[PDB]
Amino acid sequence: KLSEEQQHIIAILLDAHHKTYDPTYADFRDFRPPVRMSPLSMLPHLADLVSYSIQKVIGFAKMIPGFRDLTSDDQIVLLKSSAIEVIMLRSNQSFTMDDMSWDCGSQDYKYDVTDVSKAGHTLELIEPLIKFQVGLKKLNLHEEEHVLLMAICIVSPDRPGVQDAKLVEAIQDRLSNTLQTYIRCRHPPPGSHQLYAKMIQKLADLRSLNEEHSKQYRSLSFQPENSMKLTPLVLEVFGN
Amino acid sequence: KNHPMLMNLLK
Numbered sequence: 001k002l003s004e005e006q007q008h009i010i011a012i013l014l015d016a017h018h019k020t021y022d023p024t025y026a027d028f029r030d031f032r033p034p035v036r037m038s039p040l041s042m043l044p045h046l047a048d049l050v051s052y053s054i055q056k057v058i059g060f061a062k063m064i065p066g067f068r069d070l071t072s073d074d075q076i077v078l079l080k081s082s083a084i085e086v087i088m089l090r091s092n093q094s095f096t097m098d099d100m101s102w103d104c105g106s107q108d109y110k111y112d113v114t115d116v117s118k119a120g121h122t123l124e125l126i127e128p129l130i131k132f133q134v135g136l137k138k139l140n141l142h143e144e145e146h147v148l149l150m151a152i153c154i155v156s157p158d159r160p161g162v163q164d165a166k167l168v169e170a171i172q173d174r175l176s177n178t179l180q181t182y183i184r185c186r187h188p189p190p191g192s193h194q195l196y197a198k199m200i201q202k203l204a205d206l207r208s209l210n211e212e213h214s215k216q217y218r219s220l221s222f223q224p225e226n227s228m229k230l231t232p233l234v235l236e237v238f239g240n
Numbered sequence: 241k242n243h244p245m246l247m248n249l250l251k
């Protein structure tokens with residue numbers, strides 16, 4: 001059974017997600033407009049969406065119990081390394097399996113594989129990305145499990161550049177033990193069937209997606225005309 | 241490099 005401490009962790013993470021995820025998508029009007037019908041016509045809009053999402057991921061991470069107690073250098077390392085993965089994870093909430101798209105409230109803000117390719121990305125990323133979204137969606141995670149998985153993703157001690165790896169691991173262990181205990185005592189069978197191992201495998205998949213996205217991001221952002229279309233925060237967090 | 245925007249969002 002969940003301890004009071006573990007229940008507090010879950011409550012904090014649910015609150016953190018709800019303060020940083022807007023299921024009305026009301027801010028999307030502020031982004032540069034999507035353009036479809038120009039191999040990069042969607043780059044300005046999707047750069048703004050990604051930048052917006054980085055802000056949300058930072059806001060979520062700062063609420064993870066213990067995260068703000070790490071050194072600021074480790075906080076930065078963890079966020080720089082995990083941000084793209086948490087974006088991929090949190091985007092699953094808008095992903096719909098009926099047409100393999102991210103539906104953010106309106107047709108203008110419904111993104112399919114063509115839209116992602118129109119930000120410069122290729123099938124080498126988009127195909128595993130869609131496969132990941134479908135696989136994650138088919139787990140039918142409780143929101144508790146979803147916010148625990150994002151938190152575990154962020155506080156991973158094996159990220160490159162982490163200095164106090166043992167302190168990071170201590171936070172992740174608290175979160176992992178909370179997730180395992182939640183699955184065992186609150187996820188009804190058979191849905192709990194190897195759910196933890198499957199969620200861990202999703203973290204492995206996100207590492208592979210991270211490497212491919214970074215490879216394509218580095219190639220795209222190396223061209224100054226493309227970097228010009230990004231945002232200051234994207235350049236700072238994803239690299240310049 | 242420095243990460244002032246990331247750092248400000250962490251405060």
Ligand SMILES: CCC(O)(CC)COc1ccc([Si](C)(C)c2ccc(OC[C@@H](O)CCC(=O)O)cc2)cc1
Binds near residue numbers: 022023025116119220
């Ligand atoms: C150089 C181009 C570059 O590489 C970097 C600019 C492009 O990178 C990308 C990264 C990821 C994606 Si996407 C998995 C298709 C995605 C989908 C929905 C999102 O948001 C939905 C909700 O989570 C917001 C609601 C809220 O948070 O309130 C966010 C992202 C697309 C482009």
